[PDB]
Write a protein that binds this ligand. Structure first.
Ligand SMILES: CSC[C@H]1O[C@@H](n2cnc3c(N)ncnc32)[C@H](O)[C@@H]1O
Lengths: 155, 151
């Protein structure tokens, strides 16, 4: 079981840095970032001190397709709890069974607008993190940390 | 029953704002902040719909005792970088059933204080990389709140 974190066009340096820290906290295997908008130099200040996750490990790609090659499963995320989208909808309780023995890309979208409908169409599953139904939209890095933690919660 | 989040001496405006957002995301009942160092005005920029949490809900104290009054259980989060009988977030549901609980998180750049430890009924660690076990404050908060909500 191998985990690739894919962050699509992150906008905030704090988010990018905080995600990089989480990659070390949770021993993520691969860290890909599509066309980052955030200033990488600024992001480094929020990453795990001495870790070089941004500097060395992080792989930048130009487009979505180059970040989702060579995996078994693509799990997109959304703050909207949804047809085709219901059909691919999952929850955190589902993850353990689905990712067993697989190389999985966990894909997160833009702070402004999320993932596009086509990015979701290209993904196998669409994960929603349960939260207040009246305000379920989590900040990007906090969503990432919750998902990564779910890979660790029985330690 | 009811859950009070207690954040001691937060330094980062981003962390404070992010925490306020999470309070709304996960319907935390009470929210206290002890001697904040962060600029609360700047923190609002990071709070999104949690701005109302900062406005109306957030209580500021100048000492720790005042932030942990009138609860049944105090649970402080730390890590092995800082600190047995420690617990994990999956243990929470059994411990807190039918109780008013304060969840205490400390200032980012320092370990739990002796006071915080003395006052705490349980010490909670988030399962993580032993070489890099320290989560950023607001991300630790989000994980714990998430587990409470999941339950
Ligand atoms: C603020 S939205 C930015 C990104 O965070 C993730 N996200 C935010 N909230 C949630 C949620 N409740 N469930 C799943 N993903 C989320 C999604 O990847 C989204 O594209």
């Amino acid at each position: 079981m191998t985990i690739r974190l894919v962050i699509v066009e992150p906008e905030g340096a704090y988010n990018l840095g905080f995600i990089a820290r989480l990659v070390k906290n949770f021993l993520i295997d691969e860290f890909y970032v599509v066309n980052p908008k955030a200033d990488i130099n600024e992001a480094i200040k929020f990453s795990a001190k001495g870790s070089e996750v941004i500097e060395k490990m992080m792989k930048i790609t130009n487009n979505f397709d180059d970040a989702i090659r060579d995996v078994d499963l693509k799990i997109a995320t959304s703050s909207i709890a949804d047809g085709d989208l219901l059909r691919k909808s999952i929850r955190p309780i589902d993850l353990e069974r689905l990712i067993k023995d697989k190389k999985v890309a966990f894909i997160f979208g833009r702070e402004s607008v999320g993932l596009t409908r086509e990015e979701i169409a290209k993904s196998d599953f669409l994960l929603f993190i349960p939260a207040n139904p009246e305000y379920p939209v989590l900040n990007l890095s906090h969503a990432v940390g919750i998902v990564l933690y779910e890979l660790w919660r029985n330690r």
